[PDB]
């Protein structure tokens with residue numbers, strides 16, 4: 001209690017927000033949730049295996065892709081085992097268990113003391129009843145032509161991740177008045193009061209427009225058409241101040257976490273409006289009590305074939321195809337036929353009249369008979385779709401969370417970022433989903449690691465959602481165990497430390513000075529001495545452990561935002577290299593945007609592994625740490641396409657076609673790896689060409705396009721590029737690119753033919769998962785892109801994915817897009833150089 005009061009203070013520093021600061025609640029939902037989450041946490045903490053939780057094998061059930069079989073020769077793999085320099089290579093079968101590999105090293109190559117296989121230089125273990133092929137580190141070693149190096153050492157003590165013991169009356173609302181302490185011509189204003197479910201306004205009332213003054217009282221009752229008994233759980237009283245223009249909004253759940261109608265008096269601090277967006281939907285009141293508009297209020301008391309075809313044609317349409325009233329009555333009337341087709345649950349449930357108790361009832365008996373949904377194989381795109389903003393009913397959303405239960409960790413990891421983000425569409429703080437995220441975090445340290453940083457990312461920069469997430473993070477941190485609490489402490493300490501330096505250095509300059517490099521050197525020299533902890537997990541690569549600062553190599557970069565280039569010596573002495581761990585720290589870019597996109601890129605890579613494609617993207621690590629502040633992984637041996645041109649040509653001039661290829665060959669040691677490098681370029685250029693085209697970020701300056709010194713090409717800096725007579729492109733396929741593939745003007749090559757057929761295989765792979773990408777893209781815009789003004793923004797994705805077009809004309813459509821890049825040439829890049837130098 002004296003001890004335990006200190007613990008909460010630790011949690012609070014980890015969390016980044018005090019989940020006990022009860023200034024900003026008009027009720028107790030948070031505490032109720034903090035109290036609700038104790039059971040599922042203790043359940044999973046009681047349920048998990050300590051050994052397998054402690055070493056956390058990262059594995060997968062997915063079948064080893066074709067492109068990695070055709071890199072295995074004579075069905076064996078070469079595991080290089082180490083010890084104290086005493087190393088010995090071993091031919092192992094892909095289907096060998098890892099304990100059954102110790103049988104070879106130990107019981108072959110001349111009661112027992114059980115040990116286990118760890119990856120060299122990493123917190124990564126190949127344990128548990130799984131075949132060597134099915135471990136992701138291996139697949140990664142294969143895919144990148146590397147050698148499986150492991151140390152034969154002891155298990156981690158699984159007692160280091162234990163944790164501390166512990167009527168028919170029409171609904172009416174009385175609008176008393178509104179209150180802004182300072183109000184910056186003249187003005188009139190009214191209060192608009194919408195009754196909402198899932199972005200559908202069930203009912204609406206306005207007040208009369210009074211003059212705009214620091215205080216504006218009405219005392220009017222607003223009676224609504226809807227009956228109290230007709231109000232659905234999850235309905236929001238949404239209140240909004242207009243002047244015609246929206247100025248402020250706030251929301252309040254009409255039915256609360258206890259199934260009680262909301263009685264009594266309320267004073268609600270509201271959110272201003274910049275310039276939909278998931279912030280509009282929060283149940284959270286603005287904490288800033290001295291500068292925020294307030295509002296005060298009171299509450300007291302078998303079918304025709306013609307139709308089947310029409311039903312089928314409705315179920316077939318994309319998720320952004322709006323439903324006419326005609327479409328909805330059809331779905332609803334034939335709801336049981338609709339119940340047989342999973343693809344159609346979204347539209348079917350978007351056709352419920354949620355503001356009518358008896359229909360909602362019908363919807364629930366219609367959910368009692370959901371045998372087909374339960375059995376069907378998980379579609380994530382569909383599952384995601386019932387957890388977006390259009391679904392506010394909890395039972396509807398519960399079936400989506402059900403489908404996620406059957407996801408394996410590897411998959412949960414791909415969709416983690418956007419599931420966390422999906423909590424923002426939950427009506428209540430305690431939900432199936434938030435508990436889901438909690439169980440999977442506690443079941444697996446890898447999921448856990450990234451949860452922490454995903455939650456903490458929002459907590460640090462969303463007033464609208466910090467509290468809710470704070471209770472989810474809090475709950476999780478009381479389950480991970482002492483070790484992780486200790487790791488999270490170390491990483492937090494470090495990034496706070498390095499965040500200081502980044503901002504300091506930014507203030508001290510308006511190019512770079514010798515005085516600043518000095519200042520960096522000094523400030524960073526001091527940090528090293530005492531302040532820094534010994535080592536720490538790299539947040540974007542939790543298996544990797546950074547050690548000391550390679551101060552020699554650290555510098556500050558030549559942008560207008562002056563980021564910090566920092567390198568660290570690795571802390572695992574069994575690391576088979578002296579290569580540093582490179583981390584960029586930047587203030588000024590909204591790297592939440594970079595996160596959502598990199599993780600979509602990772603999702604596309606996995607859409608391609610299903611169709612035996614591997615387009616060699618390098619979606620590097622990015623963790624957004626607070627507001628316009630974060631870290632970026634450094635992909636070693638890489639520079640920009642621009643700087644490569646600046647070597648030969650220089651500061652300005654005619655951007656030449658010869659340079660890229662020369663730089664490639666000039667870096668390759670032999671003409672064996674160069675032709676791999678070129679192969680890599682071909683594949684990597686296509687991947688990014690397609691990925692970026694579909695995401696709408698294909699038109700980039702070559703300053704923001706990069707290439708490794710083994711031919712891997714990759715884009716960077718994804719912030720605020722989705723903005724809104726000028727020359728454009730679908731993607732950057734410049735003459736320098738083409739020159740490396742072997743073409744000019746309208747010529748052709750085999751490498752170009754490989755390119756053209758890689759794209760289309762890629763581009764139609766994505767279109768196989770049209771619906772999935774449409775949802776992910778839609779969610780990305782709402783929860784992470786400020787400037788999400790229109791839904792028209794979302795539609796871009798459907799056009800690019802050419803929905804409602806056959807596989808083949810879609811083939812030709814994409815070839816027309818590449819042809820444009822050929823016909824546009826160097827001009828757009830030149831316009832970018834012009835734009836990025838001339839105002």
Ligand SMILES: Nc1ncc(-c2nc(N3CCOCC3)nc3c2CCN3c2cccnc2)cn1
Nearest residue numbers: 589620632633634635636638639640716717718
């Ligand atoms: N938002 C944002 N994101 C990334 C960068 C950036 N990143 C990186 N990385 C190094 C290689 O590993 C991948 C990351 N390099 C960058 C930038 C901005 C400029 N830049 C760079 C680095 C070296 C030479 N020329 C340009 C800059 N801004």
